[PDB]
Amino acid sequence: PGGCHTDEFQCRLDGLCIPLRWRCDGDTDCMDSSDEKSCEGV
């Protein structure tokens, strides 16, 4: 399963799929944090 839906994100803790537009916002749509535990800035 090399993806979910359009450029969406998959979390290796659990397996869920999240709307990847929300990988750099500071709150966490995945079952952990991996949205943005790697999307720093300034």
Q: Is 22 in the site for Ca ion (CB under 5 A)?
A: yes
d(CA 27, CA 22): 8
In three-state secondary structure terms, 15 is coil
The least distance separating Ca ion from the CB of residue 22, rounded to whole angstroms, comes to 4
Q: Which of 10, 22 has the CB closer to Ca ion? A: 22
The least distance separating Ca ion from the CB of residue 35, rounded to whole angstroms, comes to 4
Host H or E run for residue 10: strand 9-10
Binding-site residue set for Ca(2+): 22, 25, 27, 29, 35-36
